[PDB]
Amino acid sequence: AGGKRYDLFGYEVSVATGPFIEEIKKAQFYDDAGEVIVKMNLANTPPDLQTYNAVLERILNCKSKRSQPVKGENKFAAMMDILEEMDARSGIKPNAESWGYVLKELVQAGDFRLGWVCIAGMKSLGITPDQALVDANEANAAKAKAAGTDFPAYLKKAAPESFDTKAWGI
Amino acid sequence: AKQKIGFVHGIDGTIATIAPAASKVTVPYNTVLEIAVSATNIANALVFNLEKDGSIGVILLDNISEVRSGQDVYATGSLLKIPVGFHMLGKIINPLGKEIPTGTKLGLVEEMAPNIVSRQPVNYNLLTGYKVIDTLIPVGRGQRELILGDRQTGKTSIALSTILNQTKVNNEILSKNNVLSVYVSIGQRCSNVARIHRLLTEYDAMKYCTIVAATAADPAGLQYLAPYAGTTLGEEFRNSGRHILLVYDDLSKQAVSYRQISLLLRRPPGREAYPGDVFYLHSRLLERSAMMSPQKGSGSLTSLPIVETLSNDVTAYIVTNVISITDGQIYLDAKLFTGGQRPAVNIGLSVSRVGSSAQNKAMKKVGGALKMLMGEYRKMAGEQTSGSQNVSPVMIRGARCLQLFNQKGPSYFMDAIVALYAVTNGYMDDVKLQYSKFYEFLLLNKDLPVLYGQVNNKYFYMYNKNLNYFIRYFGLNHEILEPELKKYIEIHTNLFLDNYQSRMNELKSDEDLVQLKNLLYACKRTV
Amino acid sequence: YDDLSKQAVSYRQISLLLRRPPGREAYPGDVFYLHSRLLERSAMMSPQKGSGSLTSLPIVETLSNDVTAYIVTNVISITDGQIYLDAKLFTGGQRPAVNIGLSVSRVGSSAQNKAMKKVGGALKMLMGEYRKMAGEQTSG
Amino acid sequence: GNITGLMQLADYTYNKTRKELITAELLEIIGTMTAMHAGKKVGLKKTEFW
Amino acid sequence: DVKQVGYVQQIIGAVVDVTFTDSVPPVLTALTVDAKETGTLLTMEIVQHLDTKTARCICMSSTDMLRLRTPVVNTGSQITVPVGEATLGRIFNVMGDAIDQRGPVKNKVRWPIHRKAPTLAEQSGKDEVLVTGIKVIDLILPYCKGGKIGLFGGAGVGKTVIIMELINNVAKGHGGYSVFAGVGERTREGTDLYLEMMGSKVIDLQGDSKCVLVYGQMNEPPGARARVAQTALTMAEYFRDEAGQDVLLFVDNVFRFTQANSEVSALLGRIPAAVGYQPTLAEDLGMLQERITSTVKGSITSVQAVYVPADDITDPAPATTFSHLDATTVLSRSVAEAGIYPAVEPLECASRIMDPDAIDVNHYNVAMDIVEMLTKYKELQDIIAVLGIDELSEEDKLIVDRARKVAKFMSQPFAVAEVFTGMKGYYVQLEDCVSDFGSLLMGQCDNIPEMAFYMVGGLDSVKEKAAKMAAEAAAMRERARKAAEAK
Amino acid sequence: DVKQVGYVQQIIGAVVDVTFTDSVPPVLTALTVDAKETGTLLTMEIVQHLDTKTARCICMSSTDMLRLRTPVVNTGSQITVPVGEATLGRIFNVMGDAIDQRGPVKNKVRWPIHRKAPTLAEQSGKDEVLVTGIKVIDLILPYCKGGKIGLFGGAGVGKTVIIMELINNVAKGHGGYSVFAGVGERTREGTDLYLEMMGSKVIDLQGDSKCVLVYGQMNEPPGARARVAQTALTMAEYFRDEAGQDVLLFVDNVFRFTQANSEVSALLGRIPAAVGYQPTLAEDLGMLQERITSTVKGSITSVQAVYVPADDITDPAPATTFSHLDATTVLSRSVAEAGIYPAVEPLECASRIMDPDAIDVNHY
Numbered sequence A: 001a002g003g004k005r006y007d008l009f010g011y012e013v014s015v016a017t018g019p020f021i022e023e024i025k026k027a028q029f030y031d032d033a034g035e036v037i038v039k040m041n042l043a044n045t046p047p048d049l050q051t052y053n054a055v056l057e058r059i060l061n062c063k064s065k066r067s068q069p070v071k072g073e074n075k076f077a078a079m080m081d082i083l084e085e086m087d088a089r090s091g092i093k094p095n096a097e098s099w100g101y102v103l104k105e106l107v108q109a110g111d112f113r114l115g116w117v118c119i120a121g122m123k124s125l126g127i128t129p130d131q132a133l134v135d136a137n138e139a140n141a142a143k144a145k146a147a148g149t150d151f152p153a154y155l156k157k158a159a160p161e162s163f164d165t166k167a168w169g170i
Numbered sequence B: 001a002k003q004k005i006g007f008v009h010g011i012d013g014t015i016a017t018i019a020p021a022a023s024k025v026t027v028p029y030n031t032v033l034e035i036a037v038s039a040t041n042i043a044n045a046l047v048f049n050l051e052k053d054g055s056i057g058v059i060l061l062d063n064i065s066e067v068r069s070g071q072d073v074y075a076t077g078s079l080l081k082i083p084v085g086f087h088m089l090g091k092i093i094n095p096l097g098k099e100i101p102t103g104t105k106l107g108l109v110e111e112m113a114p115n116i117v118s119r120q121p122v123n124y125n126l127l128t129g130y131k132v133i134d135t136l137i138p139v140g141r142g143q144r145e146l147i148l149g150d151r152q153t154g155k156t157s158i159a160l161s162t163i164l165n166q167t168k169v170n171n172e173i174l175s176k177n178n179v180l181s182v183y184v185s186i187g188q189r190c191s192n193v194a195r196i197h198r199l200l201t202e203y204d205a206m207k208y209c210t211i212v213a214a215t216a217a218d219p220a221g222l223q224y225l226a227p228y229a230g231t232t233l234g235e236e237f238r239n240s241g242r243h244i245l246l247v248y249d250d251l252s253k254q255a256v257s258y259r260q261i262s263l264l265l266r267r268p269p270g271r272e273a274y275p276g277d278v279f280y281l282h283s284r285l286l287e288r289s290a291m292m293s294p295q296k297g298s299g300s301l302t303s304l305p306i307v308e309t310l311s312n313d314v315t316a317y318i319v320t321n322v323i324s325i326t327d328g329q330i331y332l333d334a335k336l337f338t339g340g341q342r343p344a345v346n347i348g349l350s351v352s353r354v355g356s357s358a359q360n361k362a363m364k365k366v367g368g369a370l371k372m373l374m375g376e377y378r379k380m381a382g383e384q385t386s387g388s389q390n391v392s393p394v395m396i397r398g399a400r401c402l403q404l405f406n407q408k409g410p411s412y413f414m415d416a417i418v419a420l421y422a423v424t425n426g427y428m429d430d431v432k433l434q435y436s437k438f439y440e441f442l443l444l445n446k447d448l449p450v451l452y453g454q455v456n457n458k459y460f461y462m463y464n465k466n467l468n469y470f471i472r473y474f475g476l477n478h479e480i481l482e483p484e485l486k487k488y489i490e491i492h493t494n495l496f497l498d499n500y501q502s503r504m505n506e507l508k509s510d511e512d513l514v515q516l517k518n519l520l521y522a523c524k525r526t527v
Numbered sequence C: 001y002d003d004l005s006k007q008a009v010s011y012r013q014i015s016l017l018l019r020r021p022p023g024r025e026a027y028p029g030d031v032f033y034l035h036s037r038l039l040e041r042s043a044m045m046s047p048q049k050g051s052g053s054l055t056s057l058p059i060v061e062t063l064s065n066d067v068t069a070y071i072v073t074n075v076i077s078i079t080d081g082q083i084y085l086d087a088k089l090f091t092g093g094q095r096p097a098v099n100i101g102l103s104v105s106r107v108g109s110s111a112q113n114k115a116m117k118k119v120g121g122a123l124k125m126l127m128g129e130y131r132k133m134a135g136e137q138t139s140g
Numbered sequence D: 001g002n003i004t005g006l007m008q009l010a011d012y013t014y015n016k017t018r019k020e021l022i023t024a025e026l027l028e029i030i031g032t033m034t035a036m037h038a039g040k041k042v043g044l045k046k047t048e049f050w
Numbered sequence E: 001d002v003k004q005v006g007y008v009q010q011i012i013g014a015v016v017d018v019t020f021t022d023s024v025p026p027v028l029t030a031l032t033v034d035a036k037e038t039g040t041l042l043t044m045e046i047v048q049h050l051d052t053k054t055a056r057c058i059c060m061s062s063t064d065m066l067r068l069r070t071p072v073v074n075t076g077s078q079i080t081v082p083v084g085e086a087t088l089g090r091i092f093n094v095m096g097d098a099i100d101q102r103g104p105v106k107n108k109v110r111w112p113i114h115r116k117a118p119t120l121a122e123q124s125g126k127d128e129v130l131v132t133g134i135k136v137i138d139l140i141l142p143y144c145k146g147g148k149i150g151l152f153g154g155a156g157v158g159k160t161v162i163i164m165e166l167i168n169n170v171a172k173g174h175g176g177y178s179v180f181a182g183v184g185e186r187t188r189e190g191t192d193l194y195l196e197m198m199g200s201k202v203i204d205l206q207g208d209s210k211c212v213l214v215y216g217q218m219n220e221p222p223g224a225r226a227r228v229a230q231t232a233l234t235m236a237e238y239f240r241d242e243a244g245q246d247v248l249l250f251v252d253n254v255f256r257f258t259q260a261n262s263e264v265s266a267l268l269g270r271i272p273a274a275v276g277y278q279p280t281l282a283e284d285l286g287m288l289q290e291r292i293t294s295t296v297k298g299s300i301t302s303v304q305a306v307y308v309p310a311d312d313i314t315d316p317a318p319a320t321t322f323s324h325l326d327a328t329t330v331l332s333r334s335v336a337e338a339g340i341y342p343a344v345e346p347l348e349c350a351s352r353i354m355d356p357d358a359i360d361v362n363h364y365n366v367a368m369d370i371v372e373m374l375t376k377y378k379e380l381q382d383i384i385a386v387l388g389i390d391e392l393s394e395e396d397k398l399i400v401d402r403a404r405k406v407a408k409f410m411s412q413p414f415a416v417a418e419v420f421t422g423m424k425g426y427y428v429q430l431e432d433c434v435s436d437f438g439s440l441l442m443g444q445c446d447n448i449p450e451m452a453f454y455m456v457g458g459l460d461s462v463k464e465k466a467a468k469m470a471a472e473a474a475a476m477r478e479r480a481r482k483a484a485e486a487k
Numbered sequence F: 001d002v003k004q005v006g007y008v009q010q011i012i013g014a015v016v017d018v019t020f021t022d023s024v025p026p027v028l029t030a031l032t033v034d035a036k037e038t039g040t041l042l043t044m045e046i047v048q049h050l051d052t053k054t055a056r057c058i059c060m061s062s063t064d065m066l067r068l069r070t071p072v073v074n075t076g077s078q079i080t081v082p083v084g085e086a087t088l089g090r091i092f093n094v095m096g097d098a099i100d101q102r103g104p105v106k107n108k109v110r111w112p113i114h115r116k117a118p119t120l121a122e123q124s125g126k127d128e129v130l131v132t133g134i135k136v137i138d139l140i141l142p143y144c145k146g147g148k149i150g151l152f153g154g155a156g157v158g159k160t161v162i163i164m165e166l167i168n169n170v171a172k173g174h175g176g177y178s179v180f181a182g183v184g185e186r187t188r189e190g191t192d193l194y195l196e197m198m199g200s201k202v203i204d205l206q207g208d209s210k211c212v213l214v215y216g217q218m219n220e221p222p223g224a225r226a227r228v229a230q231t232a233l234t235m236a237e238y239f240r241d242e243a244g245q246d247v248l249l250f251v252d253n254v255f256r257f258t259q260a261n262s263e264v265s266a267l268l269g270r271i272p273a274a275v276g277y278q279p280t281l282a283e284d285l286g287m288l289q290e291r292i293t294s295t296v297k298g299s300i301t302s303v304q305a306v307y308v309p310a311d312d313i314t315d316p317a318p319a320t321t322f323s324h325l326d327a328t329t330v331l332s333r334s335v336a337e338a339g340i341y342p343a344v345e346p347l348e349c350a351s352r353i354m355d356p357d358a359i360d361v362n363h364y
């Protein structure tokens, strides 16, 4: 019930994607969604925009990447890398829902500076953010301003007046 | 019941000759055999020659000292196979699959490569962490780029730094776009493998890495089959849609082992004593590198083979054979390594046959500028600078970029594009060459505007480390990142030139001057 | 003959495939004797033999202006002179692109006619000095 | 004079490398040929002639 | 009726020996082994005989899990290959089996792989220039229709990119057909070429294609890698003789066809040559090259490539390939390291049709004058390296600057090199290609700077680039003025 | 029990073939002939099997007056050589026999010369600079305790003198048992070293000796020179593992070990690879090199010399020896001709401990 899709080699391609989207929505840790995308691709079902958006949803709502904890986890990096895989690699383009998920994570994390970049990138592409999230971003910014956490503490301290390999920390 | 085929006629070191039993039983070619060295233990082997009189020339791979003449020989009828799976990550392993201590599924060792329809062209990058390899010699996924150079020039360290670079990203992104790694040590010392394992455990790069060691004490047949075993581990990660990276240490040693095996088995020599079909060897090995089609999971495995070079010659048989195979090459010159700069890449001789398509949107524009700048700088750099104030901008920017190319370890993408942007756009033109890296250190780890209070930028600061995924998508040549980037770099340059450059030039004491010198070298190292 | 270098490769193939013992540059030993079987048949015959004559102009291709090769060293050892062309002169408009210093005819003047000996002696005494003068003068 | 001396060294090294390469190609060919000769059996390989 | 069976004696690498009781088949005959035991149809091709009852044959597929004394069928014919319109727009192996997953191949006929060369009476030499669009080639090496071309050069010189650009510029306008033959090629290049020919609609599957692609790559064994060119020739000679069309025959590359047989030479028992190549190399290459030639029926405009290992031109393989060509294009590392692309050396390369009678007199004269200038340019780098530019006459500096402009001008950006250059390609017509070089030859454009010639097409683009560079230079000058005014 | 017996089959130089009726022994097994026939004791190690009921084996002593049917006795073991404190201050041969004319070595156990290398778990690379007192060696190519060292140099460049200066500096003030393996070098140098040490009370025979000497020199046939380094490693590994003590290992030089194995390979019939070298050169050299490693039990700070025929680094033997070392020292002839000594070419030299993590930052 849709336009037939094709690969770069002109071969016919499947579009039946709902059964895999259900495997994403049933997930509890957002590394399983990646394996679902892989097992989808092996069956000649490439991901569509709805599938990537469901993967971003499962990313945002999940607690951890895997059952066990991992050091260096970043809830936003995986989302933005899926966006790069969408635009550059696969050719699909994101929509307002995708950037909205990406902004919800920055709102939760409190990273108020990347949120402004997400906002500017939305309206530069025509997308209109939800003012709820913009107000939450500015609120977190004001909190970090008044509390002195506008930047980390290790930046707001004097550098060594004397040059020394140990003083600068290298 | 095990089926017997003959008895060990003779044995010449790592090879053996099998004489047939009284039965007419036939053996297949390239299949594995077993030799009953004892009632309990077994010595695996592999067929390399069949002959008119039924004799079988055999390569030995385990328990060679226990082999004698007259021992019975059983046949499995199968090609050589090894265990494969995610359970092998974080392990040093014999190419036979035997784990090496420290202190169900099986994959064929010799498989065909993906055909012309089962591999997509290169689209994604592999951040080696070094600015040269990411800018002017862009390595990609599914690529097979050689690492040349004389002894002790940084060949192993480049691949190690690549593996170490990938870890920080792989801990962030999903487990499908992360690139794992294999380090195949052919003919190397066991101590080097122990040191590599310790390094990877220190930086925690061993969760996403495995090692396949075939040391010099080990049999030649094991050194011969090691890289095929590494590619066989990469088979599953291709077919499981994941990514994986191969680092074949010295393939010249892998060819010495093949020469030994062949000549001891009374195969005819060839050019430089090799049997002749040593090119087909590396061909079968390296053509397995590919960026797979979406029909096959969009998987990939990069190959970074290493080849030793004698007196900077690219005329030897193996080097030519491999340059003919590999897309690009990363030529490491002793004259530059010994000439001070490290990594000692020679851009005139190092290339990449993928180019912009490998590297990213943000890096495409910077590389398009850097290529032109270096092509202009190559023509002038032979001149001793005489127009010290009449020097061209290109002579400045190229020297600053060469200073930035100096590294020891890898570098984050965000921590490289900004540093190269400041060079190509000339923001780092007033400071002298020697301070080109201390500038970068402050630009990446000591935010001066945030320190000196000049904070007008809304978001752009080099402390977050997560702006990379916005640069990687939008690019710095965008409406939102370009002006903030300029209104960060210009204040950084101004505060530097005012406070630090001025204090630096005022030094006359030998003690403070040496303190500063050591600081600049340390900044060259850590950054 | 266009040309004898390929005749030598053919002889080498015939020999090696028949397992004749090899030699320098995978050529048999008697490959010199091959060209001597051929070029010695060239001769200016006697008045007892009809006064006939057979001239030979064997061609031999060089590679990177190598003359220390095996076939070249053999044919030079055989021939009653030689002609040496150069590509640096072929590109510089000097066509035929000879090298008079390396080009030699041991038959110097007995071949030349009465009208040609005088002209050739003059041109030799001219070119021998033109070479010394042009070799030492500047480009300007 | 210095250029001459450099030229004589270059000539000695060139001719040395030339002769060594000739010997190397010769020993290679004789080695491959010798290996082929070694791959010949000494057995009688008796067969019926009646 | 019944096909005789043979029994394997020994298996050494790609070489196998076979017994035949009744009588051995002829040389180059195909011999099958069923897929029941080894999993795939293992084909083999006799290279030489040993005894009246025993013969030895190479294998075009890898030999794995192959027992001794296995039955080997005599097909009664050498390797038959399909030919026709159905071969168009399809990838093919050595055996002719389609490896692309497009479908079966309709074949009303199937020609063999080895065939006698055309007789001297059949041959036809027609002097007719081929407009490649490339500038160096349009001037110094005018490619001849129905002739033979060779892109000599080592690794990383641009002969593959020259093949791609020549395809893009010729095969589109070539109303006949075309054939590509990857021999020891990188498989990635095969994917790139296939997707380019698909996006360019040279290979229009639903419509009508006009390009065959045969591929035996580095991964393949030597027996396949040697018999690819014969397969592509079986495809091409059909279009030449039967269909009567004009054919393009691209090859990448012949040195792999050589070294494959070299990899089997020791197994066959043949004694090697000085460089380690097979003793029959010249004959083996001639039996292929002579098939690549025009006839009274048609004309194959072949374009070949040769790997020159270690940039050693003295290597026998290119040395023998010189004679079998008409346009010996040569590429060099030096011109490539100087930032010029295509990295052609005009002095080292030559053409047969570069004659006054075959082409225009002005074209021949301009080409010969440029070639005469560049030799003096070499003789003057010999001097400037020592003395300096000051110690040369102004008449000498003039030709120095002219040659320095010519060398940079004969660089050219290609559409295929958009990835590396980042600049759109230019198609330079032959007539403009002579008016511009002649205008530069007679000092008509000496006021124009040097770098304006770098990586452009015709003379109009040069003047555009000069105006540009003057604009940015005035910008830097006035910005320096304003910076001095500011501080 | 009754001893196995065999009969000689053919002789080509040092190489012998032995037919064993019952069965062939394993490779590396020793085979002895009585002195009644040849005139002296002769042990011969098996190196390969040709067929069942046959074994090709290399002689240690000369094959003079050896016949084609001499009975041969299987010892049932590899070449066992002594170990322990009894080996101190004594010269030994390839067979572990003494030649110093002093007395019977009071060994308690003998170990085979051929041995598997340490496992990856046993190895422990500890980076510590070794102060030699030499000025070039310290700055550019700093040595490493427990690591390997290479003095790569041709004929008349000064690598033996460097070894002697390193002995006078390091070895005497080492506090650990030293070993000196002469492999195809001048017999005069062994006498000079023995007298220099017997005078320095390093080989005090009436006291405690801190040295071991093994000498298979150029006079000896290749069968000795190809298995003498293994004997010295058998001595060193006992002090490394059992005693748990740091030791040195001065090889002068490994190139004659390689030459000997090449001559042997020609006698064995193996096809030469390049420059008339054996096809198994890399394997044969790595089985010796990888035994030289600092395990957790101890450390072996080897100092190997290497010879370069015709002053050619591209010779396969040094070219393969490079990878098996931690600190190279490429000596030159032009530098020696210029009067400079040591004739080091620091641009060709290299080291592993030359990092700031090990050596101080100023030194780097």
Ligand SMILES: Nc1ncnc2c1ncn2[C@@H]1O[C@H](COP(=O)(O)OP(=O)(O)OP(=O)(O)O)[C@@H](O)[C@H]1O
Pocket: B150, B151, B152, B153, B154, B155, B156, B157, B158, B308, B342, B343, B407, B408, B409, F322, F323, F351, F352, F354, F355
């Ligand atoms: N980028 C770098 N910065 C500083 N030092 C470096 C760098 N790269 C390599 N080195 C140093 O170079 C030396 C050798 O590097 P590496 O181990 O990569 O050499 P190699 O090519 O593996 O040598 P071999 O060929 O002998 O194995 C080491 O001391 C290492 O620390």
Ligand SMILES: Nc1ncnc2c1ncn2[C@@H]1O[C@H](COP(=O)(O)OP(=O)(O)OP(=O)(O)O)[C@@H](O)[C@H]1O
Pocket: F153, F154, F155, F156, F157, F158, F159, F160, F161, F162, F341, F342
């Ligand atoms: N530091 C030094 N001062 C003076 N002379 C030296 C020095 N080092 C070496 N030589 C000289 O070099 C020559 C040979 O030294 P040495 O015996 O070490 O040679 P080698 O390196 O062992 O070479 P070979 O073993 O082939 O003779 C002697 O004449 C010796 O005096």
Ligand SMILES: Nc1ncnc2c1ncn2[C@@H]1O[C@H](COP(=O)(O)OP(=O)(O)O)[C@@H](O)[C@H]1O
Pocket: B351, B352, B353, B354, B355, E153, E154, E155, E156, E157, E158, E159, E160, E161, E162, E341, E342, E412, E413, E414, E417, E420, E421
């Ligand atoms: N027209 C061109 N513009 C820019 N770069 C080129 C051009 N032609 C060749 N190159 C260089 O050559 C590389 C590809 O080499 P390739 O042609 O594949 O080598 P070979 O032809 O020897 O196989 C490119 O990646 C690039 O560096």
Ligand SMILES: [Mg+2]
Pocket: B155, B156
């Ligand atoms: Mg290395």
Ligand SMILES: [Mg+2]
Pocket: F159, F160, F185
């Ligand atoms: Mg000495």
